[PDB]
Amino acid sequence: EGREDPQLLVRVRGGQLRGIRLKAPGGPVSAFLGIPFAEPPVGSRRFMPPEPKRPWSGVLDATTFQNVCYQYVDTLYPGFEGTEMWNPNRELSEDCLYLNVWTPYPRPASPTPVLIWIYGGGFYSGAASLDVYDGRFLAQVEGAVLVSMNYRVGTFGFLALPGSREAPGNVGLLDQRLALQWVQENIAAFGGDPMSVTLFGESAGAASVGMHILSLPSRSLFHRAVLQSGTPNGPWATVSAGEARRRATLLARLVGCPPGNDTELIACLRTRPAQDLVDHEWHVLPQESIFRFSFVPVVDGDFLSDTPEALINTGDFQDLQVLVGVVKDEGSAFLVYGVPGFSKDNESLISRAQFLAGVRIGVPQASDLAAEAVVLHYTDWLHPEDPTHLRDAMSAVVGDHNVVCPVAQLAGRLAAQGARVYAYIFEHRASTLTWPLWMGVPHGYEIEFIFGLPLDPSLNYTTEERIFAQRLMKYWTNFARTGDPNDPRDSKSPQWPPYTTAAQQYVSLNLKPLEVRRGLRAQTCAFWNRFLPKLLS
Amino acid sequence: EDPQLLVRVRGGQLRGIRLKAPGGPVSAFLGIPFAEPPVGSRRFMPPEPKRPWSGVLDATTFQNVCYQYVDTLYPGFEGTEMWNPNRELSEDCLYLNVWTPYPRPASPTPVLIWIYGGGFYSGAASLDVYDGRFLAQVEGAVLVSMNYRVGTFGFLALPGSREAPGNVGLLDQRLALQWVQENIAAFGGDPMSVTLFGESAGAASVGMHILSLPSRSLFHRAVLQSGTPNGPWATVSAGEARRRATLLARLVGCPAGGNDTELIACLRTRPAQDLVDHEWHVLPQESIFRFSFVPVVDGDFLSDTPEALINTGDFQDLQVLVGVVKDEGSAFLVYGVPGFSKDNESLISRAQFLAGVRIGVPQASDLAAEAVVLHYTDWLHPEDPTHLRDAMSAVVGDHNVVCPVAQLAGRLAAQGARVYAYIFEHRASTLTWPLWMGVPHGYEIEFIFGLPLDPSLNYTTEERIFAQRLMKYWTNFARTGDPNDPRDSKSPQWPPYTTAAQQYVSLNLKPLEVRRGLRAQTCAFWNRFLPKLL
Numbered sequence A: 001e002g003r004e005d006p007q008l009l010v011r012v013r014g015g016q017l018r019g020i021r022l023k024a025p026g027g028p029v030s031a032f033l034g035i036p037f038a039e040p041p042v043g044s045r046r047f048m049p050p051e052p053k054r055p056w057s058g059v060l061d062a063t064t065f066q067n068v069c070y071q072y073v074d075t076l077y078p079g080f081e082g083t084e085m086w087n088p089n090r091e092l093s094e095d096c097l098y099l100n101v102w103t104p105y106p107r108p109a110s111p112t113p114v115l116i117w118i119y120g121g122g123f124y125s126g127a128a129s130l131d132v133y134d135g136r137f138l139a140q141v142e143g144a145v146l147v148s149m150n151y152r153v154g155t156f157g158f159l160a161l162p163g164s165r166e167a168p169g170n171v172g173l174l175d176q177r178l179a180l181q182w183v184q185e186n187i188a189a190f191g192g193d194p195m196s197v198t199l200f201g202e203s204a205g206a207a208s209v210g211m212h213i214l215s216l217p218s219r220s221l222f223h224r225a226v227l228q229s230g231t232p233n234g235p236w237a238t239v240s241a242g243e244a245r246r247r248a249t250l251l252a253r254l255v256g257c258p259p260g261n262d263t264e265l266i267a268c269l270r271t272r273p274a275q276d277l278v279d280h281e282w283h284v285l286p287q288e289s290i291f292r293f294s295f296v297p298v299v300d301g302d303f304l305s306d307t308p309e310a311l312i313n314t315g316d317f318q319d320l321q322v323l324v325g326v327v328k329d330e331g332s333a334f335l336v337y338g339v340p341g342f343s344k345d346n347e348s349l350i351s352r353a354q355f356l357a358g359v360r361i362g363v364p365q366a367s368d369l370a371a372e373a374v375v376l377h378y379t380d381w382l383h384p385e386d387p388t389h390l391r392d393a394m395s396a397v398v399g400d401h402n403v404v405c406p407v408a409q410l411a412g413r414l415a416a417q418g419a420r421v422y423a424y425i426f427e428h429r430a431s432t433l434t435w436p437l438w439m440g441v442p443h444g445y446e447i448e449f450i451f452g453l454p455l456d457p458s459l460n461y462t463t464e465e466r467i468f469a470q471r472l473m474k475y476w477t478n479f480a481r482t483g484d485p486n487d488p489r490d491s492k493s494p495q496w497p498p499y500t501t502a503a504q505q506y507v508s509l510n511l512k513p514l515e516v517r518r519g520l521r522a523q524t525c526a527f528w529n530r531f532l533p534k535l536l537s
Numbered sequence B: 001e002d003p004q005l006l007v008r009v010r011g012g013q014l015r016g017i018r019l020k021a022p023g024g025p026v027s028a029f030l031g032i033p034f035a036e037p038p039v040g041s042r043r044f045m046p047p048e049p050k051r052p053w054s055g056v057l058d059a060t061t062f063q064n065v066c067y068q069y070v071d072t073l074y075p076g077f078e079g080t081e082m083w084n085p086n087r088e089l090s091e092d093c094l095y096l097n098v099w100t101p102y103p104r105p106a107s108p109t110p111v112l113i114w115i116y117g118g119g120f121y122s123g124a125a126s127l128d129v130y131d132g133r134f135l136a137q138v139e140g141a142v143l144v145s146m147n148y149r150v151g152t153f154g155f156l157a158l159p160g161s162r163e164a165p166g167n168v169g170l171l172d173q174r175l176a177l178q179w180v181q182e183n184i185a186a187f188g189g190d191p192m193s194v195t196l197f198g199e200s201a202g203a204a205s206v207g208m209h210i211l212s213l214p215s216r217s218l219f220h221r222a223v224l225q226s227g228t229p230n231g232p233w234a235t236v237s238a239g240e241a242r243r244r245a246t247l248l249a250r251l252v253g254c255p256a257g258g259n260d261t262e263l264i265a266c267l268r269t270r271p272a273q274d275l276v277d278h279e280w281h282v283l284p285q286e287s288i289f290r291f292s293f294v295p296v297v298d299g300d301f302l303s304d305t306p307e308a309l310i311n312t313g314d315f316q317d318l319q320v321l322v323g324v325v326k327d328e329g330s331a332f333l334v335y336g337v338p339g340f341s342k343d344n345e346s347l348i349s350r351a352q353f354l355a356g357v358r359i360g361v362p363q364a365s366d367l368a369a370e371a372v373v374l375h376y377t378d379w380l381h382p383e384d385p386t387h388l389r390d391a392m393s394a395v396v397g398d399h400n401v402v403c404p405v406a407q408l409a410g411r412l413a414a415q416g417a418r419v420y421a422y423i424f425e426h427r428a429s430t431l432t433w434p435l436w437m438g439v440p441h442g443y444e445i446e447f448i449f450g451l452p453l454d455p456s457l458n459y460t461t462e463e464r465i466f467a468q469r470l471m472k473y474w475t476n477f478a479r480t481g482d483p484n485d486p487r488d489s490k491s492p493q494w495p496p497y498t499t500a501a502q503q504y505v506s507l508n509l510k511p512l513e514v515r516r517g518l519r520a521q522t523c524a525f526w527n528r529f530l531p532k533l534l
Ligand SMILES: Nc1ccc2c(c1)c(-c1ccccc1)[n+](CCCCCCc1cnnn1CCNc1c3c(nc4ccccc14)CCCC3)c1cc(N)ccc21
Pocket: A072, A074, A076, A082, A083, A086, A119, A120, A121, A122, A124, A125, A126, A202, A203, A204, A281, A282, A291, A293, A294, A333, A334, A336, A337, A338, A442, A443, A444
């Protein structure tokens, strides 16, 4: 046939695809949703590296989002858009290694910069099919080819018996590398420039992006990287070999797979229903905690030849261009998932006791001395009992420790070692946010703006937000295009300068024009990055 | 003979001198002896009261300065010399001075007693900056200052011994205090309204009288300026004093030991200058704002450590005035911290800053020292010399003065005392120290004493009015326990310092500003965290 829209028929290397023509506000875009890039990682392939997708015959239908990787569904606030917007919107299946491509309609005559999105979700949840990752706007408005992939999360993606053949760990990264490889090979068929691939992701996806920066076999598959609210370095994005070994073994035991070599154990895990692994995942953490996740990248001496901090300290990043940044309230969201005293349904004014308790959960790896050091640092000694400040300090601790200071260390090390870094703080609370006021601009809530959702008039964003969304997409795609988020023509708008060790410049993203600022929580991050380590004894 | 200049005290008759103050005449009784000269066998010993004398004792001049180390850092430089002895040195130095109004006050006047500082190793009540003349004349106060023994002579202790029990300098002071109870009325002072006030070491001495029950009946109120009994430099342990006494004895040929009595006997046979010669050689570490012989925690004068005493004391009917100058640490830097001098802007390196902290917090472990550095670095301008220099100064001032002051203020206030706190931020126009030193340790005294009221000293009109303000606060404080002017009904009120609000006031040329929290975050570092690095 024959009768179909010729713009929707594309041949990639596994065979032919039929895409779908979608409405964006400013006009039509092409979508090729659910292109499979790996062999379904099921049965004997669980815990195993992805294998490239074997070619198919006929025209593969690529008009709808394919399955979401097997994962824990958040039931903290039943019916609450604030949590439900992050939950899976397609069937849960182990057969989920699919990707998506948005492109202009009609596809552009000459090659186009390619953004590749990697979702977040604590390496345990996430799905490229979620409303907030909808590439139609970037495609229609900026003329960009945008690609997002599903990668295996949780045990399926990250359970590791390091040194083993049957479960070597890091397979979720490997799924992402494979989507990356696929783009090199096929994106041209859609008018993307494979010589201009920019990786971007937020939170665990941001951490992912950083891992690709740090893994030799991924460096050839992209040219530019964007890390939103996450990093490879830090207390949560990786575990050591021993700790991953401990967690896998403990989970194995929990589902009735007693540990005594690795083959028997992994074989037994492979016989277990996927829902059983998910049901037991949370139980392997070493302490009561927040912003920690059971199955995450392992420092395997393979994908990661050393710890991320060792590699950012000694890596040569002679031109790499990265844009890094944070939201105003990185910590706030985490507090409702565990910390007593905190809730979305009230003001969360906590007591000093609740605060000391929170710091323990919030910095679980820290001794008595160190936890008391954090508390002394974040206490306002002028009002040391004030419920509002205590609440906000709890939020700042979780935020600073897990996101802001890792981001600061990242920028600093990169910049000091050849990279062109652009740094930002995103301060706009959405008008449409359902979370309470006290949470500020929570973790994840710049994404809807970077992706352009406010441009959809049916979504009820303000005109200001629509103009803002447009500004943001211009920064992002200018950066993709050029390595520089500035417009080479628009001299009147204030310029966004690179981040450097000498001046530590970064910009505010809010409804007002760009304001340049110096030092990203410089003083407090000296605490977390330089001092708190030295409380090693 | 002028009857106004003739007083009979318990030991006999005294002849004063009428002195010229700007606004009128004052009566001075200088060099009154309050103790048997603590010489020969009485060296290292508590003071005995002065024996009665015959006829009329000439009290028209300052008496000898207690034997001390004379500063030779910058010879003849005003900034340093103004602290050096301005009379002959002598172990025979237990003399006090009284300035009173001319004529003698008609009714009992509040009495204000000054105790100089000098790191318990130097000082003298005869120094130009402690001139009682102005407060006498202008505010009508009877002002009293004593010499007390310093250095080995005042504070060498072999604790538990009969012949060198330690703290005798403090006992000298206590005896001057007793003398005031017994005699001041004779000069028109009210023995029922005595305010102790002192700066630096003198401030810590005042603090020690607060914490020592036998001193408490000799005064009703206190003022601690840039100094505290608590904190890193004002006391030593019994074991630590023993060690330095012993080491000093070794350094001068004495006697090894063997026997306390024997060791002290030998020390007593040594010329004063021999003791001073080796005074500086007994410190455990390279350091600054540490002093060889200082009060000892004897379990007698000081029943426990000042820390223990302020934590658990009852200070219900006590009024205290405490404060600090803007740049407590700056002066100390020129005394041994490499890279610092008065003769240039002193723009140090990072290495110099890290080396300075070791010196500055001598007791500090490797980790504790790094905690300090990481706390005081401006992570935005990490290697800027101006920032490092100012930081080095801040470290020393905070560690030794401001946070100790902050801690004392809070304990007292929590435990019944009525506390008023200040930061003094005016740089005297006459200052011969360089700009980068700011308002150095000890340059508020000048103002409190009323020196800018003497037109010959070339202070500005502004400064004379500022000095007048200050004398009103202090003497209002002596008068009532409240530095506020109960006449002026037109703000801005100086509020009591409390744990809750932490209110204190800026003392500068502009009218009182009320600030809250005296380096609250930085002193949490120093007072709460840092102990926990044991
Ligand atoms: N009784 C049980 C049984 C099993 C599990 C349970 C509890 C909990 C838990 C729930 C409530 C309170 C305490 C613990 N967690 C807690 C995981 C921590 C969730 C923190 C929020 C977060 C952080 N990154 N991804 N997510 C998941 C939710 N998706 C979001 C995302 C983002 N931002 C936000 C912001 C607000 C709310 C949600 C949200 C941004 C990036 C992508 C996802 C789990 C974590 C596991 N790894 C496995 C099982 C369970």
